[PDB]
Design a protein around this ligand. Structure first.
Ligand SMILES: *[C@@H]1O[C@H](CO)[C@@H](O)[C@H](O)[C@H]1NC(C)=O
Ligand SMILES: *[C@@H]1O[C@H](CO)[C@@H](O)[C@H](O)[C@H]1NC(C)=O
Ligand SMILES: *[C@@H]1O[C@H](CO)[C@@H](O)[C@H](O)[C@H]1NC(C)=O
Ligand SMILES: *[C@@H]1O[C@H](CO)[C@@H](O)[C@H](O)[C@H]1NC(C)=O
Ligand SMILES: [Ca+2]
Ligand SMILES: [Ca+2]
Ligand SMILES: [Ca+2]
Ligand SMILES: [Ca+2]
Ligand SMILES: [Ca+2]
Ligand SMILES: [Ca+2]
Ligand SMILES: [Ca+2]
Ligand SMILES: [Ca+2]
Ligand SMILES: [Ca+2]
Ligand SMILES: [Ca+2]
Ligand SMILES: [Ca+2]
Ligand SMILES: [Ca+2]
Ligand SMILES: [Ca+2]
Ligand SMILES: [Ca+2]
Ligand SMILES: [Ca+2]
Ligand SMILES: [Ca+2]
Lengths: 542, 276, 276, 276, 276
């Protein structure tokens, strides 16, 4: 289950890829609204003429156009407002010559297959005031044909050129949420995308060497039509805040905690309270799942926007936390130690040979309690054995597995979810879950053990009796050999052996944190292992 | 109590019976008689309440325990009826034209209800279980309901045009609406004249007995069409004069209250618990 | 499930699993704020209720859980107050001229009262024990009392002459009368504009808190002179602006709720004791 | 000392008491008596300071230890009060109209505070903890608050239009503002007339005692509505003349100092510790 | 945790040196630069503060963590200067005519002074030990002193006539008076124009450093003639351009801060010793 953390870090690069496009871009009840809509829209034309005698036009281009109308839907006269715009246009040009006399078109816009037509749509119906929290949204529409019409050019001399022809089919491709800016309020609207397909009518300009040109110029794209109409259906699923099964809001304009809080302050208490209802054996079963990104983030009942960015938002927050910086510092220290036989003096070794895993550092030191040097050394080492946990250099199930299992079983139960809450609750959970955790390394039927709390223990596997802890041997063992998380750490092991005489195989498995022995002991309702796992779960307190 | 509510109570099938407690029950309780105005009009006496109190005392009630509440008619009494005493006896005059209303009144006062406010202008409303109803009372309540579908569109009604809604109650002092469960309904009611609440029937009341004066067995205190239970608390008598009715009530107060039970009078006098 | 009986509950003094979730209160329970009209006047914002709901929602209360109720003044609010939310907070402004009234108001809402009807025309009334009071409410309650003797004749008064009655309340919107126990009294009350009820103080009303906005501690919710308890539900805050008062209420709403408990009379556990 | 602050101190429960240190404390400390100007006016004497110093000398304070500081009134004294010597006794005259102000002054000088500057013109501000408040003082304060949402838009107040902001103070010489924690607030303050700081309550101030001259217990030195502590350093006395008040202070100086503790004096006399 | 108690510290000599804390202190501490107005005049740039902030950021200080305070001249800066940053550096221009004043300023900001009030009108004053001085500050101080013999009679002066007193200051904006210890002096000071305080020198002030721009080593921060200690917090630089001075300060900010230490008095460990 710890794999999720690793994967987030591993995938953190994609987060950057998101930000780029983003900065290029700019309980609950499900209620359904399938509505048969009729989008009536149109284009506008900007015809800016150049100086001189009027033979030259500086620009003849598209311009967004607004439209209002009323139509019948299930016997309801519904007033609708739409705004049509275009994107990705081809800037053709005509250059009759350098003289002021010759027909010149500096830049005229034609929409082709590489363009897109965007249409905001709104109405005063119920469906369009329930779409603040949206689960799913999908619209189908019959394609429409937009043909270009005639447009004569105002030359006072000679034949009048005419812009005839031109046609494109708009086919529905995608619908999203959008906003209409009024004078004093802001309206939620449905913005439909339409892909263009060139059609047989080819637009040409008379008095010119222009023919068999395809697209839809901006000159007279309406072709005299009052509007362009597409009839279809849009399906919307809205998440309405409801705390009882008999009520259902007509409108969902309700405020949620994240509309007012950006730093979750009291949701920490919600999580700490949720911790009570956690089962033990089933938690182990969940912790043994290789929880990947899909498994972790598939079961959350999100909104339309939240699901679209859950993984990358979580990862954006993830590649900043103390865990990510600790991983980065460990990697840099290892690379520096490997990169130069120059500063073995700067680093001081608590082992036979120098290693980044076995270096002593700042440790401002705590005179509050009489502290042995060995305790400080072991604590400093264990704080990096945590990065060993998150570097696939462990053997048994690790504390990170338990942390991930608790995180999953809590986020699914927690009713507090939002595009900003899941970030900083996954990351801060990984940071603050099980802060005091111990590790052990086995060698020649002897177990060495260290803890971030500063407690160290050396003992024998066959019989759990403590041994003079041999620093400079625990360090050499721990730099290379597999490191085992101490789920059933020495004290619990000795208590269990004294009270519940365990077999050689059971002790073997418990030492290496084998899941099977753990779950079998839990199923027997053994108070000691249950107590230890309860302490571990309550340590996952965020 | 509350911490021991979900605990067993064990009793041997040989424990000796205790002496009669009706005397102490009368000495420690209060009795309320609800009668129409026409009863007092026909009696045509001012001291009749005092005489009834004295007769009840002859039947074992301390002077001060019997109270008499007068209501105009069944319809008016149905607007937020109040049950004051430990024991409530309601003398409902039978009118063949108000059967449903009578039933409704009985259904309200013979049963415990748990009710919530209904902002019909802001929410659609479902009835989740057969025990869920919509109790509306006021000066004049007119309820119009539009059943929606899974797509929040009215069925047989235009969700915006109230004129197409379905009339389930018109100018009602009290009405207990029961719609199909699991269906969201859009409601429009004369909110200025009446209040509508989403209520749950919790069970019987056990301290309100309805005596129907004249008529036949017409009360139906259960919305289920295939049940018309006649509990011990709903009695029926025949009458030609009201003094005989009151003498019958006094002389058989022992039997009337033997069908009722204390421990059910709420702290509030209202006919339903309310949760806003 | 066992509702009519008080069964003992046993617990272990060394029991583990002291879990908690105050969030259960926020999402399941509703909050009601009762404030005077002058507070809204001074605030002078047409959306201040929305802002306060937002701020409460910062504290975990989902929108729609918090309700705001307006009352003109202490005297008007005292006429049959109806507090229905799960948690009730009453911002009562201090008026040095209206001490007793405030006390009475608090005594009515901070305690639980079991009230029976009073027919002053028919019956003479005693107060059996220390918890027995006579609570009268209405637009103008004027209560005059004539104590009797064992021969039923008045003491310092004539039963047939109300002019000699000893006035104890004059034009009161709410008044709690305490007279000598074990003495019959003839009561003259303005029944047209006032209803008087014979009430027993069962105990504290856990889910009602009163925040006194102003002067010093003056409330006396106990008729006994020797004791003037100040329970945790009787808060007191100094003020100059009402926005400050409401901000203090919202910021410390958790402590205000902590000082309160669910109404012991309003849950299924108390079923068939008095109410639900 | 500082390196050993986080070390245990072990003491036997049988160690002999040391002799009284009251005499040594008086011989090695300084006392400040803050009184209103009306006290000096009513006493109407030019040598009363000398008489009080001599009377304190009779009580053990060497000449030169007692100091007398005069303030015009609570409002003027509340503008950055200065506490000069080891023991500060503030005689605060009670006016029923300024209760909150008195409380604020007490809450300023009876507690340690850690304040930081607030650039209300540049940034929005939050109150992180219940111990966090906004203390503003000067010639005249007028604080308008606008809570914002996650999108920085105001709530019940347009960000640009200060006229829509919520007023919490007006022409205040001192005010402690407490807004809902975790919500960003845009502040409009009369920075020209008064300064606002983001302050944190560290704990009690042992070297400052406040004697309330007349009135009742009205001081509230905690913003929490549920708590209104009356610490040993908050005295209250009744008065008809100021000479009696001063004689009472002198005679019971031992008790007053007993309610206070040494080592709480700072180099600076300010009412807070300023970090910038 | 254990405040007000001096516990011994028993560290060992073999524990390894910790990593550099310079970066963390720069990240978590604030720096104040005090310079004369002529500096900003000569620099003649409206954004020089921003450039210096950016350069300090190149040296590791977060943007906005460096404050630039301006003072007119030494005399104006000696009017109770308030140094509130974690690290304070005072760029003091040298003037041969203002040597003593310069020293006085240093003696007030490079040391720690526990000051108690002085009522010259009421009490006579003596300086108990060599660490006790009389610091007077304000618009203009003119201190005249009359030593008194054991007969409380002036020595070379008349207690009644202040013209016979001895002048120790004249029109001073700050002066540290050191008189013979153990002698009671009658003081005549322009109290209306400036204030005097009895101050004990506790020890060095570690967060304040003084950089003398131009001149020679003239500061004498000790009243003792036999000692003229140039501490590590007193720097001296020769200058021609103020831009050069500021570039020197920012370039060697590491060395300047190294010479300084966190104010021992202003921090949590000093709680109930003098502050925080
Ligand atoms: C209380 O919490 C503990 C751990 O926090 C958990 O084991 C227990 O099941 C919870 N609830 C009960 C009722 O014991
Ligand atoms: C109950 O009734 C019996 C017979 O009527 C009588 O003798 C007895 O005293 C009564 N009381 C008790 C407590 O048995
Ligand atoms: C304390 O007081 C006692 C008795 O009053 C006296 O004998 C002793 O000298 C005093 N001082 C000490 C340090 O015990
Ligand atoms: C520790 O000291 C080294 C040696 O100079 C230095 O490079 C490093 O930045 C210091 N700090 C940390 C956190 O390693
Ligand atoms: Ca009816
Ligand atoms: Ca219809
Ligand atoms: Ca139904
Ligand atoms: Ca039926
Ligand atoms: Ca009389
Ligand atoms: Ca009253
Ligand atoms: Ca009584
Ligand atoms: Ca009392
Ligand atoms: Ca004030
Ligand atoms: Ca406003
Ligand atoms: Ca606050
Ligand atoms: Ca308080
Ligand atoms: Ca000087
Ligand atoms: Ca002289
Ligand atoms: Ca001296
Ligand atoms: Ca010297």
């Amino acid at each position: 289950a710890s794999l999720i953390y690793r994967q987030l870090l591993t995938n953190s690069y994609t987060v950057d890829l998101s930000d780029e496009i983003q900065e290029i871009g700019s309980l609950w009840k499900e209620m359904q609204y399938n509505r048969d809509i009729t989008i009536r829209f149109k284009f506008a034309s900007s015809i800016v003429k150049s100086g001189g005698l009027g033979y030259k036009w500086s620009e003849i281009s598209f311009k967004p156009a607004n439209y209002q109308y009323t139509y019948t839907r299930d016997g309801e006269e519904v007033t609708a407002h739409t705004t049509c715009s275009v994107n990705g246009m081809n800037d053709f040009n005509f250059n009759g010559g350098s003289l002021p006399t010759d027909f010149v078109i500096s830049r005229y816009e034609v929409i082709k297959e590489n363009s897109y037509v965007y249409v905001d749509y709104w109405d005063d119906s119920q469906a369009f005031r329930n779409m603040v929290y949206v689960r799913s949204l999908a619209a189908n529409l019959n394609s429409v044909i937009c043909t270009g019409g005639d447009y004569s050019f105002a030359l006072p001399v000679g034949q009048w050129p005419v812009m005839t022809g031109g046609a494109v089919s708009l086919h529905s491709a995608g619908v999203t949420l959008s906003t209409q800016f009024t004078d004093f309020v802001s309206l939620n609207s449905l913005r439909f995308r339409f892909r263009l397909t060139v059609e047989e009518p080819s637009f040409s300009i008379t008095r010119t060497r222009v023919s068999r040109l395809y697209g839809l110029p901006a000159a007279n794209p309406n072709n005299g039509k009052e509007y362009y109409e597409v009839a279809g259906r849009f399906s919307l699923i809205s998440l309405v805040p409801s705390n009882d099964d008999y009520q259902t809001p007509i409108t969902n304009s309700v405020t949620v905690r994240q509309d007012l809080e950006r730093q979750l302050g009291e949701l920490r208490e919600e999580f700490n309270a949720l911790s009570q209802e956690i089962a033990m054996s089933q938690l182990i079963d969940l912790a043994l799942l290789p929880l990947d990104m899909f498994s972790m983030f598939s079961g959350i009942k999100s909104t339309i926007d939240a699901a679209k960015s859950m993984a990358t938002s979580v990862m954006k927050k993830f590649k900043k936390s103390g865990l990510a910086n600790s991983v980065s510092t460990l990697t840099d220290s290892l690379s520096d130690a490997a990169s130069s036989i120059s500063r073995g003096a700067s680093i001081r070794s608590v082992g036979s040979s120098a290693s980044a895993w076995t270096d002593v550092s700042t440790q401002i030191t705590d005179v509050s309690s009489s502290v042995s040097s060995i305790s400080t050394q072991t604590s400093t080492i264990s704080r990096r054995l945590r990065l060993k946990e998150m570097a696939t250099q462990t053997e048994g199930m690790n504390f990170d597995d338990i942390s991930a299992a608790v995180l999953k079983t809590k986020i699914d139960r927690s009713t507090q979810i939002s595009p900003n809450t899941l970030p900083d609750i996954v990351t801060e959970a990984s940071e603050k879950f099980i802060p005091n955790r111990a590790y052990r390394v086995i060698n020649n039927d002897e177990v060495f053990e260290a803890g971030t709390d500063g407690r160290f223990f050396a003992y024998r596997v066959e019989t759990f009796d403590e041994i003079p802890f041999d620093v400079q041997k625990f360090a050499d063992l721990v730099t290379d050999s597999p490191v085992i998380s101490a789920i059933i750490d020495f004290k619990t092991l000795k208590n269990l052996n004294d009270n519940y005489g365990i077999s050689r195989q059971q002790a073997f498995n418990l030492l290496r944190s084998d899941p099977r022995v753990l779950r079998e002991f839990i199923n027997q309702d053994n108070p000691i292992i249950r107590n230890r796992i309860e302490q571990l779960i309550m340590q996952c307190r965020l | 109590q509350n911490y021991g509510i979900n605990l067993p109570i064990t009793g041997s099938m040989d424990t000796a019976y205790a002496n009669s407690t009706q005397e102490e029950t009368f000495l420690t309780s209060t009795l309320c008689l609800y009668y129409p105005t026409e009863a007092a009009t026909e009696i045509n006496d001012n001291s009749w309440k005092d005489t009834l109190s004295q007769l009840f005392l002859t039947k074992g009630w301390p002077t001060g325990s019997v109270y008499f509440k007068e209501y105009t008619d069944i319809a008016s009494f149905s607007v937020d009826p109040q049950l004051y005493c430990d024991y409530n006896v309601v003398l409902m005059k039978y009118d063949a034209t108000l059967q449903l209303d009578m039933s409704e009144l009985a259904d309200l006062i013979l049963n415990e209800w748990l009710c919530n406010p209904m902002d019909i202008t802001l929410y659609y409303y479902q009835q989740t279980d057969e025990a869920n109803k919509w109790i509306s009372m006021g000066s004049s309540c007119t309820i119009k309901v539009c059943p929606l579908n899974t797509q929040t569109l009215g069925i047989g009604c235009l969700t915006t045009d109230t004129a197409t809604f379905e009339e389930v109650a018109t100018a009602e002092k009290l009405v207990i609406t029961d719609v199909v469960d699991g269906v969201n309904h859009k409601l429009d009611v004369t909110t200025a004249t009446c209040t509508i609440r989403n209520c749950k029937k919790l069970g019987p009341r056990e301290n309100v007995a309805v005596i129907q004066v004249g008529g036949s067995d017409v009360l139906d205190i259960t919305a289920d069409p295939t049940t018309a239970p006649q509990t011990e608390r709903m009695m029926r008598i025949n009458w030609k004069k009201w003094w005989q009715v009151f003498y019958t009530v006094v002389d058989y107060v022992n039997q009337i209250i033997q069908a009722m039970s204390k421990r059910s009078r709420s702290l509030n006098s209202a006919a339903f618990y309310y949760r806003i």
